[PDB]
Amino acid sequence: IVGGESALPGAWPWQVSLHVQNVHVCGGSIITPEWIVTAAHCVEKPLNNPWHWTAFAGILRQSFMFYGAGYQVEKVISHPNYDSKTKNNDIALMKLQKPLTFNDLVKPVCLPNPGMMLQPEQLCWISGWGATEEKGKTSEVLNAAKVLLIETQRCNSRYVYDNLITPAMICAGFLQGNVDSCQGDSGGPLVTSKNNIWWLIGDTSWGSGCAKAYRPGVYGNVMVFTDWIYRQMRADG
Amino acid sequence: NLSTLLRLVHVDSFSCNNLDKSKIFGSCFNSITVDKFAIPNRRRDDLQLGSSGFLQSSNYKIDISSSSCQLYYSLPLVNVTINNFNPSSWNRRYGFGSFNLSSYDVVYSDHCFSVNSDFCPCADPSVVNSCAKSKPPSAICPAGTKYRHCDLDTTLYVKNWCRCSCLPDPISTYSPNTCPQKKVVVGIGEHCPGLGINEEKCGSSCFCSPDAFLGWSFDSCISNNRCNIFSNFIFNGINSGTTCSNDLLYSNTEISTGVCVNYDLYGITGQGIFKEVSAAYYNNWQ
């Protein structure tokens, strides 16, 4: 997050960070208290054995324990049609063995329903634990930023990406720069305000640097694979 | 004399703001600044008092908080020419030629741009060698001006992908902060620093293409077989100075003989009948 500010302890209970080997790697979002949505590029072959993974939720500053007080991941399911070259369909799910009872600062976000008819230049918020300016370390505190949504047609310009955005992808941020996520902000909740409620309509997969001109933020479109997630519910029980 | 000025010129319209035409008869001023230029047949509404058009931002701005007169007149198309010249020094520094347009056509700008002293629409050719996609032309920029800012970045699998600034054009760019060319508005009696230069058609020495210049337009100025010209007169100083007018009652009255009238002949007063007489004993100074 570049150009943002420190996130005050308000009500943003849809950010769960997945830690492996007692170090922070990426975050995620929750929709129901039985699953965690995250990116699929961090679930590669060297990242197997989901038993050595923990989840942290409702924790602003990442210092409250050491190799304990977490939730173990039971099983991880990645998208079958995932390509590591073009980075398409970057959606992964993780299952926890804990009931995850609702309490203070614990409230998931509902899935976006089809036919939302969102505005092209829609305003959204991004958050995560990444670098500060460029190639920095993991931020100790939680920061947030405000971005705008740009259409896919303008994002496919030859001077920006030269037609490298799949229909299941989207672009957001500012073309002028200074507002972008750096390395480490994988996943991330991209929620928008509508009908006085938040809708998660984004998923960070990759990006060409941060705070750079002609290099906006790239996000995954989960609206096409939302029903696919429902298919995973058929595998629940 | 305003009478002779309005008679010898085909005056079409005249109006003075913050100054009435009644007090002009017999007044004095300190200095007079006169501007004039032809009127394009497309922006007749821009010459009004107060308008955020292209002429007031790139061509010329008219002051409103001062007493100034505006005149619109016409000139015959016989034995007349229009001098189309670009006063931009940095635009002509890189090899700018002429407009090469037809006669009786005036050129007006739609957007005025400005750059700093350290500016060169030309990239360092030693860096462009490691570029494969969107490779801009490069040449040797003269000393004192830094080369074009370009960076090679990889998105997913493209190693040689060089992106520069001022894309696609300085008129409509996605990041005006990264482009040194900045849109500016002309002030009271200030010329425009220059127009926009497309860096993709520049680059031997750095020689930009003549078609890479954008932000201008041409329009005829022929109306009823005559050309319309607008002029602005600014009278600095009021009731003072050494610039007066003879628009008072002393307007070269006609002589008369038969009745004695008042005398004001070269600082002399009196009365007396006049009588015409042939005399040849006078001189030049007498």
Swiss-Prot record, chain A:
Q: Which residues form the Peptidase S1 domain?
A: 2-237
- What's the impact of mutating Y161A? No effect on catalytic activity. Almost abolishes HKU1-CoV viral entry
This chain's protein is named: Transmembrane protease serine 2 catalytic chain
Outcome of mutating N178A, per the record? No effect on catalytic activity or HKU1-CoV viral entry
Q: Which domain of life is it from?
A: Eukaryota
Organism, by scientific name, is Homo sapiens
User: Outcome of altering R61A?
Assistant: No effect on catalytic activity or HKU1-CoV viral entry
Positions of disulphide bridges: C26-C42, C155-C171, C182-C210
- Which of the residues are on side Extracellular? 2-237
Mutating D162 to A/N: effect?
No effect on catalytic activity. Almost abolishes HKU1-CoV viral entry
Location comes to: Secreted
Q: What is the effect of changing R154 to A/T?
A: No effect on catalytic activity. Reduces HKU1-CoV viral entry
Q: Which consequence is recorded for altering K212A? A: No effect on catalytic activity. Reduces HKU1-CoV viral entry
Region: HKU1-CoV S protein-binding; residue ranges are 85-215
Task: Name the residues annotated as catalytic in the UniProt entry.
Answer: H41 (charge relay system), D90 (charge relay system), S186 (charge relay system)
Summarizing the annotation, the consequence of altering T86 to A/S is:
No effect on catalytic activity or HKU1-CoV viral entry
Q: What is the effect of changing W206A?
A: No effect on catalytic activity. Abolishes HKU1-CoV S protein-binding and viral entry
From Swiss-Prot, chain B:
Task: Specify the superkingdom.
Answer: Viruses
- Protein function: Attaches the virion to the cell membrane by interacting with host receptor, initiating the infection.
Q: Where is the BetaCoV S1-CTD domain?
A: 1-246
Q: What is this protein called?
A: Spike protein S1
- Per the UniProt entry, the glycosylated residues are N1, N79, N100
Q: List the disulfide bonds.
A: C16-C69, C28-C244
